[PDB]
């Protein structure tokens, strides 16, 4: 059967590493944010069907600028993306998760609002979560509390607990080798190791500082390829992306790679 959620052309490494995918992207700022501080919605104008929605949250003290690059990068491959500012820059992870879910709720509401640029563009049954540091911890909390989410891809995550063993959502963890804010061996890696009930992946950027996956980073080719491939594979069920999502990228830019329960296009063996 034709996968009803497949969008865009067959992927190549070059097309996933480029700065933009196939679709034209527009954006708007949310007029009256509902349950969070502010939001920018990125969306494809011509995806060829409804697409899933992804909500992205920054870390402590941080604002949309730190995570903004994901907006165009994901939306140009066929997603509606909302980046947010939290009610307070000093909100903790559980609050960030609530606000993340409120942003997804509002994307669904705008999909139903005839005046909105994303009217009828969203499949509100297919949602994902991303975010940086405390916003990454908030993404994992969102996944733990809302298992119908289709994918999570936090970056340099931190939470006051590293035990995310209840998560059944496919989760890709971006980590930064030299992170001194949320050190990998006390945060991102114990988080990754705690999850035994899901498809999961761990991708650590060689020499990365705590901001190694943020706007302006020097690995947008690899990080953007992996984020889009993960979201395509698991939010769209798009098996064209099974290998890009699950495979070791064999990159000089990677200082650790792990994956579990990720079938990468090799049959049953």
Numbering used by the authors: 1 to 269
Q: What does the report in the manuscript say about this coordinate set?
A:
In 2016, a research group from Keio University identified a novel PET-hydrolyzing enzyme named PETase from the bacterium Ideonella sakaiensis 201-F614. One of the most important characteristics of PETase is its ability to degrade hcPET at a low temperature (30 °C); due to this property, PETase is a promising candidate for a practical method of recycling PET. For PETase, the portion circled in the structure is the active site, which is much broader than those of the other PET hydrolases; this active site may explain why PETase can accommodate a large substrate, such as PET, at moderate temperatures. The enzymatic degradation of PET is a two-step process in which the enzyme binds to the polymer substrate and subsequently catalyzes hydrolytic cleavage.
A flexible linker (GGGGSGGGGS) was employed to link the corresponding anchoring protein with PETase and HFBI separately to prevent interference from occuring between each anchoring protein and its displaying target. To explore the structural difference between wild-type PETase and linker-attached PETase, the crystal structures of those two proteins were determined at 2.0 Å and 1.5 Å, respectively. In the structure of linker-attached PETase, we can only see a part of the linker (6 amino acids) in the form of an irregular structure, indicating that the (GGGGS)2 linker is flexible. The two active-site pockets were almost identical. The above results revealed that the C-terminal fused linker did not induce obvious structural changes in PETase. In the simulation, the (GGGGS)2 linker showed high flexibility, and no unique structure was observed when the linker-attached PETase was displayed by the yeast cell-wall protein GCW51. Moreover, this flexible linker separated PETase from GCW51 in space, meaning that the two functional units did not affect each other.
